[PDB]
From a paper:
In contrast, in our CaMKI320, the P-loop takes a canonical conformation, the C-terminus of the regulatory region (residues 300–320) is undetected, and the nucleotide-binding site is amenable to nucleotide binding. More intriguingly, the C-terminal part of the activation segment encompassing residues Pro171 to Thr181 assumes a unique helical conformation (designated as helix αT) with well-defined electron density (an average B factor of 39.8 Å2) and the DFG motif at the N-terminal part of the activation segment takes an “in” conformation. The rare helical conformation of αT is stabilized by the hydrophilic and hydrophobic interactions within the activation segment and with the surrounding secondary structure elements including helices αEF and αG and the αEF-αF loop. Specifically, the hydroxyl of Thr177 (the phosphorylation site of the activation segment) forms hydrogen-bonding interactions indirectly with the hydroxyl of Tyr195 (a strictly conserved residue on the αEF-αF loop) and the main-chain carbonyl of Met168 via a water molecule, and the hydroxyl of Ser173 forms a hydrogen bond with the main-chain carbonyl of Lys167. Concurrently, helix αC is rotated outward and Glu66 points its side chain away from the catalytic site, making it impossible to interact with Lys49. Whereas in CaMKI320, the activation segment including helix αT and the β8-αT loop occupies part of the catalytic site. Although unphosphorylated, the side chain of Thr177 (equivalent to Thr309 of Akt/PKB) is oriented inwards and forms interactions with the surrounding residues to stabilize the specific conformation of the activation segment, shielding it from surface exposure and hence from CaMKK phosphorylation.
When activated, CaM binds to and stimulates the activities of a family of Ca2+/CaM-dependent serine/threonine protein kinases (CaMKs), thereby regulating their functions. The catalytic core of [name] takes a canonical bilobate architecture, with the N-terminal lobe (N lobe) consisting of five antiparallel β-strands and a prominent helix named helix αC and the C-terminal lobe (C lobe) comprised primarily of α-helices.
Numbering used by the authors: 10 to 53, 62 to 299
C-alpha cells in the first residue's frame, strides 16, 4: 500500500483506457523507470477489495502491481495489457472458430472462477475489460479492469445502465444487488458476441433495449448463428439466463461441453463475426 504525496510525481499520464463510475483507468508511464502501466484511479471496506485484488494472481487476470494512496485518492497500478481489445483482435484474425471463442471464454471463466473463489465479483465484465496479453496470435486474454464494490452503489448501477446496458445483468438493471451470477451473465453475453459479433441486446429504442435485457429476450439469429453449434447456444442460454439463481456458475460453465469437451465447432466463422463486430464496435 505505497504512499505518494503527488501521483504526478510517480507517473505521467496519457489518456483513458476505459472509464467506469467513480473510477477512471488511465495509461501512465512510471516516471523513474519508464514502465507503461494502467492506473485505476478512484476517489470518494473497499480497501479490503483492493487489498485482495493486490493478492490476486492468475494468468488471465491483470496483475495489480501495487496501489498508491494520495490523501483523498487511491491509484491501483495494474499490469498494462497491450495485446488489443478482444473484438479488435477477433477482427484482425484470419481463422476464427467456436474453438477460439471457447478457448477465449474458458480463460475468462477460469479467471472469473478464480475471482469468485476469492469472493471478489468483477461487476464490470465487459469486452473493453477483456484484452489480449500480447500482440501474438495465440495470446492469453486478460481481465484488465475490475468493478470495485462501489459499483454495487445504486448511483453506479444506473450509470452502468446508461453506459452500455448490454453487458450488465438483468438483476443489476433491476437495481437488485450484484452477485457472482452477474459476472457469469456477462461471460454469456461476451460468449454471445464472440460467436456472432453483435450484442445479444440491440434495440434502437432504449426502453425496448432494457426490456430485452431484463427479460433476457435475445435470440440466436440467422444467418449469424446457423453455423454455431447447439452446444455453444446451450452454453450461452445457461449463462444468459435472466434468473441469476438458474444462471450457470463459473464451475458449471467450465464443466459445460462447449468449454470442457470437444463440442465447439472448428468451422471458421470469422467473416461473419468480424463483419458484425465492425458493424457494432468501431
Amino acid at each position: 500500500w505505497k504512499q505518494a504525496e503527488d501521483i504526478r510525481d510517480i507517473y505521467d499520464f496519457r489518456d483513458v483506457l476505459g472509464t467506469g463510475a467513480f473510477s477512471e483507468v488511465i495509461l501512465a508511464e512510471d516516471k523513474r523507470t519508464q514502465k507503461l502501466v494502467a492506473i485505476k484511479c478512484i476517489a470518494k471496506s473497499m480497501e479490503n477489495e483492493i487489498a485482495v485484488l493486490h493478492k490476486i494472481k492468475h494468468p488471465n487476470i491483470v496483475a495489480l502491481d501495487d496501489i498508491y494512496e494520495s490523501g483523498g485518492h487511491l491509484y491501483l497500478i495494474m499490469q498494462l495489457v497491450s495485446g488489443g481489445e478482444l473484438f479488435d483482435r477477433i477482427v484482425e484474425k484470419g481463422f476464427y472458430t467456436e474453438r477460439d471463442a471457447s478457448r477465449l471464454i474458458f480463460q475468462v471463466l477460469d479467471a472469473v472462477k478464480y475471482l469468485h473463489d476469492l469472493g471478489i465479483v468483477h461487476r464490470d465484465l465487459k469486452p473493453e475489460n477483456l484484452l489480449y496479453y500480447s500482440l501474438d496470435e495465440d495470446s492469453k486474454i486478460m481481465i484488465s479492469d475490475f468493478g470495485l464494490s462501489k459499483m454495487e452503489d445504486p448511483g453506479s448501477v444506473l450509470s452502468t445502465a446508461c453506459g452500455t446496458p448490454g453487458y450488465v445483468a438483468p438483476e443489476v438493471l433491476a437495481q437488485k444487488p450484484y452477485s457472482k451470477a452477474v459476472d457469469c451473465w456477462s461471460i454469456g453475453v461476451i460468449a454471445y458476441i464472440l460467436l456472432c459479433g453483435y450484442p445479444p441486446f440491440y434495440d434502437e429504442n432504449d426502453a425496448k433495449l432494457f426490456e430485452q435485457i431484463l427479460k433476457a429476450e435475445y435470440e440466436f439469429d440467422s444467418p449469424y448463428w446457423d453455423d454455431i453449434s447447439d452446444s455453444a447456444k446451450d452454453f450461452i442460454r445457461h449463462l444468459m439466463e435472466k434468473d441469476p439463481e438458474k444462471r450457470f456458475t463459473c464451475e458449471q460453465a467450465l464443466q459445460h461441453p462447449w468449454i470442457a469437451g470437444d463440442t465447439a465447432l472448428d468451422k471458421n466463422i470469422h467473416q461473419s463475426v468480424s463483419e458484425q463486430i465492425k458493424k457494432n464496435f468501431a
